[PDB]
């Protein structure tokens, strides 16, 4: 495998929850006297007071640089065009890399099979995890997620972060005795590439698969920047609730290159009733569930009109005397 | 490879043009006294007069059946819900299978490496090719495509066929001395699955690739039943004009299984000026071309903000002291 | 008022149901031996046999002409680009105008206040009503609408007509002892112009109003050619179920002028459970209903964040010391 | 007229530029030592140093309150969920109302026909104008708009403001000797309600009209958070370039009330070549211009297939012997 797949599996093997790192972030948040709201300024003062790091807002960085840290003089420059929550994320990432280096190193050490480059990629993944666990302190964030019935927009509003950051954190609430809904988080683009997979436990799309066009995550770009929802049934009978939305943040100019992603959060149908997104939806009727697969070549459904490729198991008859609206049927 | 890939390659190796079969379709159209306009009605009586086949419009066929042929009674049943052009397509498909069986077998014989199942799939593909070349007689269709400046909707209106059928036929106009624009034809779904590839000549997506989310074909579902267009530049500098549109032919009920596809037609930029779809677009300015790829793992571009995966030829730079809006950058 | 408003009110006063005309269409359908399926051909033979009218499919008419009738030689020319159901509609319209002229004249005579031009416009409206009542014979169409739970696509498939034609006919099922769901039918464009209003009984948007942006009919263009649905609550507490879909049929060329409309069907919430479109929706929860109005200037809702104009009744305070996300609040 | 129309006309009569107020904002920005970048922080301390006003970021304000000012304690509370540029806008609005009160009163006095309520609405409009001219200092903003070729996203990024705010300021650059492109600015919703009109000079939609569904501004909701563009020709031959985009600023919860607007900027075609949005479009070909109107009842075009209502100057032709794809044709 490749290094990003190695690190995806590194997080999947740990149920997408790193107890030592999460508790470290929360403990530092509390001991520093942090308060939710305007964390970028408080994080600047924590960098200065605890690490001698001077944080400066720089509009002189290249267009694509979100931050740069100069370790010779200990100066952290943060992009002016980042919103406060993004600035705080950048600062907390660097905070993990300079202030939690040994804890990150030992956590990486717990997987001896990781390749040389996968270890650095995992270091960056764990720094991102720390930044998420610092911006969204575990007990407070879990506590608000339950009060708000998992409304991602309201969570982002209360904590001053975006949709993708909230979904990231929601997929990590696997602390023993204070678990949230077990989620699978995915990020896709317009061509169906899934560039992020994180899961609390085993799901169909945790590691591979996900190229079924009836899956609602791919429909997010058809209805941009509005939450889509679906009650999906996999070919093995297991049922899931999926919500997805496009994240499209540029301001790189009309001519510039644009980045467009969709973020999806899925869970077992049995949890759907605790989500605000199930409002108005009937969840006790298996006939209203949408039948999806994992990708046409690994999907054994026999009567799918959307089917793009034949199922690789077994083969269908070819009939010169029949025409059908079900491709590769028999 | 699998059999549908074998037949995709069978047609690709022949420049998507089967001269003997195409000329057979045109000669039969002319000798039978056919006329564009109501071809379904004329095809029914040509079946009766020439092959003793009785064509019946059956509203008792199963919901998913487009046709069924009973060779014992020589009875062809066609679905009532097919529009006239689709009925004509079904009848001409059966006409190829019963009246051009030996020439189709002889054409198949020219590829000795075809597997046993690939031969049946190729028989059905060649019957479809014949039906297309019969509904859209080569010389008449070519002259209409040039007169209409390749307006696909206007061609469908003149010949009483749909969008996908016109694009199919347009990608086959490789008869020596009467060439149309050389096209690559693709059919995709919302998850990026490309279920059809047909090519007049060598193109980047003739056989594999096409999972770039900046390619306009994947943007077709965001703007349904609207033609989208793009001037694309591949990483090797070669430039192309792409037109695409969703086809949604259903009415299987609100609850029923739904069919959603997008069809794309691509050509060299040098031909774009004879397309009606080039109206209003500047074609002589390489800075206005959109830079796309074939798929992130096989794309070597250095500064793509949309990038989903690291390029396999490259290596993963990791910088703990920098944050960037360019994922997996060089 | 203007003539189209005069005729809209002419139909509204009659509960959108013309008993004499509807029974005439159904009686002629039965006495002529018509059968659902391929009505265009049977209507051609009925024109010839009963009225001496020769029906011909003409590709020589101007682009915009659907039909033309030459009364000196009794020849009806029908556009080749019309699908069979549209051809049948055209033929039945002319059939009403030549074969039901006196019945139409007396029905018009029952409204003495109609202006001179409104009488001709009403003649055309009643001919259209006859064509709808002939293509969709009352007892058979009502009988299928109940069996199919009002699935508009399935009704169109069975009767070979489009979405707008089915919705038209569904809004007319007010025959005593065999009434369908009482519907209001509207047609809008992208700018909110409502160009058709028909209602079985009194509804909020029967004659005026309908410019509320939270009403789902205006959202149809955001999700083109897919059915949208909404449980709406008017400011007076009454609740309604709304379904809408875009109808976009051109083939007038990429450069040509395009016609894009959305068609909406609404009913009281108490009927929603008989629609297939209520599947998966909770209808016994007044908290999940969306609060809409009739247009901001005639809407008295006090806490609408979407509000575009102040409500004309009373006035709100202007406060220099407050900023609010509720425009024109107080 | 009503008071919001009175104030729309107050600004329209002044070419959407208030010279004394604009120069006051710029002079105060310069004399205070302000710098673009973190204006919310600098505005808080300018309030404290110059007016004794204590600015507080209050997460205890009601959900819908952007600000509240207590003049007894001179305490300005600003909503925590406002991004920095919006916070700066709120503070500068209050700054206009407390620190430029007499000049605003004097500017209002120049329109003696303003009703008593229109004067308060004009006071708030002028405070908003001051806030815009303070956040976006005239000469600096004008030079940046010219350097960036009017790229609205890039201007928002440089100045830390949103799309609507930039378009607002762009429509005000009518200072003699330093003119920007003369623009008309509109804000619409999904139902076609135009809730804002601001104009540098006389335009067709400066005061009324704008309900043409072929106008690209109404197409913005079909392509959400994507800039749409159009070369439009009014029925009198005059041609315009239009850019539009939806603004969706919410996160009031999945169930909460939602805000959806589209903002459009229009100018003479002769200026289109200095816009970045003109990249790739041919502007010297009047056949490629789209023919639009001001609203169907006030539009005299003869062959519009989209037409919703009969033109009021015309008369209704009715032909019982013809069917046409042109509703209400001449
Ligand atoms: C996959 C990756 C390359 C994508 O890069 P990118 O597309 O440039 O985007 P980023 O993930 O850096 O940031 C985008 C959003 O994700 C959010 N995010 C990323 N990791 C997060 C985490 N662990 N917790 C919370 N939020 C997180 C950021 O806050 C950001 O929100 P914003 O856009 O509103 O500012 C990048 O996330 C990465 O390097 N991750 C670490 C390696 C890893 O875990 N790989 C496994 C892949 S499954
Ligand atoms: C690939 C395949 C299974 C797809 O099946 P499907 O999804 O049921 O769709 P079909 O292709 O049968 O029909 C869809 C449209 O394509 C059109 N079409 C298909 N082949 C055509 C041809 N050779 N010429 C013109 N039109 C054609 C049909 O007319 C139809 O138009 P319509 O929707 O208005 O009725 C089927 O086309 C097939 O078996 N093709 C032959 C095998 C082959 O060539 N495989 C390699 C393809 S990569
Ligand atoms: C309003 C009007 C001018 C619109 O014209 P148009 O936009 O050219 O469209 P048409 O209504 O002629 O036809 C469009 C669809 O409506 C359908 N339709 C129209 N009247 C119908 C009726 N009474 N029953 C069933 N279907 C009907 C047609 O079948 C057609 O379906 P199709 O597009 O798939 O072929 C036209 O309907 C008319 O003249 N109506 C009669 C006058 C009237 O009743 N005015 C009151 C206005 S509320
Ligand atoms: C019309 C009105 C009620 C709309 O209220 P609203 O829908 O709550 O929206 P607001 O205009 O208050 O704010 C929305 C955006 O417009 C921007 N805006 C408003 N006036 C502006 C100005 N003069 N310059 C720059 N930006 C301005 C705000 O900054 C805000 O940007 P944001 O969304 O990123 O925060 C309100 O703008 C108003 O009272 N205006 C003054 C009265 C007036 O001029 N009326 C005639 C208009 S036709
Ligand atoms: S066969 Fe149908 S259900 Fe299975 S993956 Fe393909 S589209 Fe999805
Ligand atoms: S790296 Fe960028 S250009 Fe290349 S395939 Fe991926 S998205 Fe397309
Ligand atoms: S005030 Fe709100 S609910 Fe009322 S019509 Fe306007 S947008 Fe609709
Ligand atoms: S008649 Fe046509 S061009 Fe004129 S306003 Fe109506 S839709 Fe627009």
Numbering used by the authors:
A (entry chain A), B (entry chain B), C (entry chain A), D (entry chain B): 152 to 481
The authors write:
Upregulation of the methylcitrate cycle (MCC) is required to assimilate and detoxify propionyl-CoA, a cholesterol degradation product. We show that MtPrpR has a novel overall structure and directly binds to CoA or short-chain acyl-CoA derivatives to form a homotetramer that covers the binding cavity and locks CoA tightly inside the protein. The regulation of this process involves a [4Fe4S] cluster located close to the CoA-binding cavity on a neighboring chain.
The asymmetric unit (ASU) of the P41212 crystal contained two protein molecules and was equivalent to half of the ASU of the P212121 crystal. Nevertheless, the overall crystal unit cell volumes and the structures of both forms were nearly identical. Therefore, the predominant CoA was built into all protein chains and the CoA molecules fit into the electron density.
